[PDB]
Every structure is written in C-alpha cells, then in structure tokens.
Design a protein around this nucleic acid. Structure first.
Length: 147
DNA sequence: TCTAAGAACTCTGATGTCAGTAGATTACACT
C-alpha cells in the first residue's frame, strides 16, 4: 500500500521517455503481483481534475487511470471519500481541453473502456455515465465537428 | 467686347483591415 501510493504520487518526469518508464513499472506492479492494493484513487482525481485550458498536466491521471483499468479492471470509486457525481464529471470534462491530443482524446479512450467494464459488471452507473459522456459530446457536435 | 482659376461632386483604384482556412516549418522525440 505504501509502495503504490509513493510510485504513483511521484510518477511524473520532465522527460517523456522517463515518464513512460515509471508508468510501465505500475502496469506490472499491479497486474503481475498484487490483489493487496487499496488503489490510491483519492490521489488519481487530483492527478487529472485541475482545470486550465492549456494544461498538459491533467494527462498523467488519464494515463494512470488507464493502468488501473487495463489490469483486468478493478472497480472505480468504492467508498474512497469522494462523490461519483463530481468525480466522473471531471473525467469526462477533460475532453474539452482540445489544445493537446494526449489531454482530450486519451480521456475518451479511457471512457470507452469504462463503459465496457460497468455495462458487463451490470452495475447502475452506466445509466448516468453514458448520459455524462453523451451530454458533453453534444457540445462538440454543434461547434467542433472534427473534435 | 469674355478665358482660366479657383470651386464643387462623383467615381475609380490602392492599401490596410479582419476572420477564417490550411498549408509547410519547426521543434520533439526515439533507448
């Protein structure tokens, strides 16, 4: 638990090739080696949600949520002191930051795996998260046909 | 006994402007 919270908190690097390596430690550090996780999801929100139109620095929480997804899909936001009605909204809202590809599109790439999880685990949140996604993409449909 | 210098108005042509489009240039990056 102390390892994962540290490895994820300090994951960033100013050099893309190094940052990509720190991230790749996490991928095997979960999927090859721990059930014993208590995944640090209260961090993960802060690692993406801080709004600014020219942020690149939202992107790490996108990529990192993509690691905690891709390891055969543990659940998201169980009882971690944060509200699903705010948490997922930001995670969609990220795809408004159209200045940089890895900021906006990678959020959609994660969400297209989240639906595949929640729908196949038959949980109720796809009744809302599908509406969060649908509501935001409509804002592009009328204004930014390419994005 | 009248012939130009001074008006006046419209019109034409270039220069600069704004918004929007999209190309080519220039950085960024690979272990």
């Amino acid at each position: 638990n102390r390892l994962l919270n540290f490895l994820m908190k300090h994951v960033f690097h100013p050099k893309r090739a190094v940052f990509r390596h720190n991230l790749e430690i996490i991928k095997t550090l979960v999927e090859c080696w721990k059930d014993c996780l208590s995944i640090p999801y209260r961090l993960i929100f802060e690692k993406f949600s801080g709004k600014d139109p020219n942020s690149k620095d939202n992107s790490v929480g996108i990529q990192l949520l993509g690691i905690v997804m891709a390891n055969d899909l543990p659940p998201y936001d169980p009882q971690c002191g944060i509200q699903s009605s705010e948490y997922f909204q930001a995670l969609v809202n990220n795809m408004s930051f159209v200045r940089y590809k890895e900021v906006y599109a990678a959020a959609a790439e994660v969400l297209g795996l989240i639906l595949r999880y929640v729908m196949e685990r038959k949980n109720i949140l796809e009744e809302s998260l599908c509406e969060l996604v649908a509501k935001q993409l409509k804002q592009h449909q009328n204004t930014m046909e390419d994005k």
